[PDB]
Amino acid sequence: GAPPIMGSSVYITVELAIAVLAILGNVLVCWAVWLNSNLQNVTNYFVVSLAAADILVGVLAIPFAITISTGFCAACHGCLFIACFVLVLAQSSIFSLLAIAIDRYIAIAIPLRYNGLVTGTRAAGIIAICWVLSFAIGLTPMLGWNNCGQPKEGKAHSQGCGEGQVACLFEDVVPMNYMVYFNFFACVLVPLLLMLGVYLRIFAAARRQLADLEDNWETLNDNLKVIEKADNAAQVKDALTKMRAAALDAQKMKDFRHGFDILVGQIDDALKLANEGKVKEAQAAAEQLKTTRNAYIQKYLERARSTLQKEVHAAKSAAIIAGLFALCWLPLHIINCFTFFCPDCSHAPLWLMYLAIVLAHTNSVVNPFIYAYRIREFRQTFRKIIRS
Numbered sequence: 001g002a003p004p005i006m007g008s009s010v011y012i013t014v015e016l017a018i019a020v021l022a023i024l025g026n027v028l029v030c031w032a033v034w035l036n037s038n039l040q041n042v043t044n045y046f047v048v049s050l051a052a053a054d055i056l057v058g059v060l061a062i063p064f065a066i067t068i069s070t071g072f073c074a075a076c077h078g079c080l081f082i083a084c085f086v087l088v089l090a091q092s093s094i095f096s097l098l099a100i101a102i103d104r105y106i107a108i109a110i111p112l113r114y115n116g117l118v119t120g121t122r123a124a125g126i127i128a129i130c131w132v133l134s135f136a137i138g139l140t141p142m143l144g145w146n147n148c149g150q151p152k153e154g155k156a157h158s159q160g161c162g163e164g165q166v167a168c169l170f171e172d173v174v175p176m177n178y179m180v181y182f183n184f185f186a187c188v189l190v191p192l193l194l195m196l197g198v199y200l201r202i203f204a205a206a207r208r209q210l211a212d213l214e215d216n217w218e219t220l221n222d223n224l225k226v227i228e229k230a231d232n233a234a235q236v237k238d239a240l241t242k243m244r245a246a247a248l249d250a251q252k253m254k255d256f257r258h259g260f261d262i263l264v265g266q267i268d269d270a271l272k273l274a275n276e277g278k279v280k281e282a283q284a285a286a287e288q289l290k291t292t293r294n295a296y297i298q299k300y301l302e303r304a305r306s307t308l309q310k311e312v313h314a315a316k317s318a319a320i321i322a323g324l325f326a327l328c329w330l331p332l333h334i335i336n337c338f339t340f341f342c343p344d345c346s347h348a349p350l351w352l353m354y355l356a357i358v359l360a361h362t363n364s365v366v367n368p369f370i371y372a373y374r375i376r377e378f379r380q381t382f383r384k385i386i387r388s
């Protein structure tokens with residue numbers, strides 16, 4: 001048996017390394033948002049919320065993890081706080097991730113109302129509630145759902161703890177049914193599945209809005225080709241009737257309104273010519289539609305197409321952040337599941353336990369790199385602060 005202090009030294013060094021990067025990179029996220037007013041959205045108030053969570057992983061949770069791993073003697077309820085605080089920060093991150101996803105769904109589904117419905121004063125109120133909830137969920141073991149009432153007292157006498165003290169060890173004070181049923185299933189897993197559903201709807205609503213754009217556009221010019229080589233006023237009538245409905249449908253800030261005002265007006269004129277039975281001047285009236293289409297309607301088709309692609313790109317960035325949360329945190333939860341559901345199994349070896357803790361802490365480093373690579377306003381603000 002190698003002296004514990006040697007493997008301890010690898011663990012502590014790595015933890016300290018991670019804390020440094022967690023703090024630095026996430027202090028940069030918060031500086032960027034404060035400086036650049038382009039970055040002050042309700043979306044970014046939640047990303048600053050989870051940057052705060054990540055900062056406190058490095059300043060508090062990682063120091064707590066280092067000391068919990070020693071088994072130091074302590075009063076059991078003080079042990080519980082050291083051991084559970086990180087669950088507060090984990091829960092806060094889940095709420096922030098959930099909020100961002102809901103915000104990005106509102107953005108894409110009802111852009112009309114978004115600015116009305118979502119505002120930075122209520123966002124701040126939502127964030128405070130979420131932290132309070134996060135202390136409640138994460139510090140529930142201290143309200144009585146703990147193992148303090150039954151100390152492993154042979155382990156306490158071996159390390160020579162004083163009376164009322166335990167050897168502070170996570171799986172000794174925190175019950176595993178809390179961790180698996182209440183923490184993992186209800187408080188982590190259920191919210192993640194909800195996130196998964198929100199993102200599914202977002203990509204669905206963007207995909208079928210693009211289809212509706214391209215449908216209305218193809219409806220516009222096929223009707224035109226029908227008008228073109230028509231026979232009577234009755235068929236010209238139909239293919240402008242389908243154009244105008246498609247115009248009003250596609251319509252749903254000043255040069256855009258012109259473009260359609262001319263378009264439906266041009267249609268409307270060809271319509272009455274058709275009704276009065278003059279076919280070929282109804283045709284001729286309908287092909288300067290072609291002029292308005294090229295000068296106006298397709299710059300609308302294109303910049304609307306350009307904006308949906310930005311919103312999907314922004315929603316895929318947010319999705320990556322949530323996915324990396326799940327990746328970094330699931331192994332620990334899965335190991336607790338084995339520990340709890342299979343008492344016939346050998347406990348996961350100690351080195352794997354610490355690999356899983358280290359991997360969960362690593363999540364506190366990744367997000368700043370995700371912003372810098374994937375959202376240009378963040379990346380250029382990062383550059384501006386760094387060089388200055």
Ligand SMILES: CC(C)CCC[C@@H](C)[C@H]1CC[C@H]2[C@H]3CC=C4C[C@@H](O)CC[C@]4(C)[C@@H]3CC[C@]12C
Nearest residue numbers: 060073074075076077078079080081082165168
């Ligand atoms: C705002 C920030 C800077 C303050 C951080 C407060 C932390 C470091 C404080 C608050 C509660 C503290 C202790 C709570 C009670 C106990 C039980 C005792 O037997 C050993 C010390 C121990 C385990 C704690 C030590 C650290 C402690 C956790």
Ligand SMILES: CC(C)CCC[C@@H](C)[C@H]1CC[C@H]2[C@H]3CC=C4C[C@@H](O)CC[C@]4(C)[C@@H]3CC[C@]12C
Nearest residue numbers: 327330331332334335338345346347348349352
């Ligand atoms: C990418 C992420 C989400 C998947 C992570 C899969 C990991 C966490 C899975 C894969 C294989 C797993 C277990 C394989 C079998 C053993 C031996 C058993 O006595 C304790 C659990 C233990 C030690 C494993 C626990 C963790 C386990 C390592």
Ligand SMILES: CC(C)CCC[C@@H](C)[C@H]1CC[C@H]2[C@H]3CC=C4C[C@@H](O)CC[C@]4(C)[C@@H]3CC[C@]12C
Nearest residue numbers: 189330333334335337338339340341342343345
């Ligand atoms: C990954 C997301 C989508 C769902 C999480 C699935 C979890 C709950 C699933 C995946 C693998 C599962 C089990 C793998 C095999 C065993 C050994 C058995 O003796 C007790 C159940 C146990 C220990 C697992 C229980 C929980 C289990 C870990």
Ligand SMILES: CCCCCCCC/C=C\CCCCCCCC(=O)OC[C@H](O)CO
Nearest residue numbers: 059060063064067072073074075082162165
């Ligand atoms: C805002 C920024 C401020 C930064 C804040 C720094 C965070 C505190 C660091 C580590 C806390 C862990 C300390 C707990 C270790 C206590 C050990 C102990 O209690 O020794 C008792 C002995 O074993 C017999 O009782």
Ligand SMILES: Nc1nc(NCCc2ccc(O)cc2)nc2nc(-c3ccco3)nn12
Nearest residue numbers: 087090169170171179332333336350353357
């Ligand atoms: N099971 C567990 N253990 C620990 N630390 C104890 C690692 C260990 C496990 C067994 C042992 O005999 C000595 C040490 N931290 C832990 N953190 C979590 C956790 C936090 C959030 C989700 O899981 N689980 N967890």
Ligand SMILES: CCCCCCCC/C=C\CCCCCCCC(=O)O
Nearest residue numbers: 058059060063066067068070072073
């Ligand atoms: C920006 C400020 C960050 C504050 C971090 C403070 C650094 C402390 C580092 C690790 C503390 C580990 C304490 C060791 C536990 C006690 C040992 C024992 O009781 O046996």
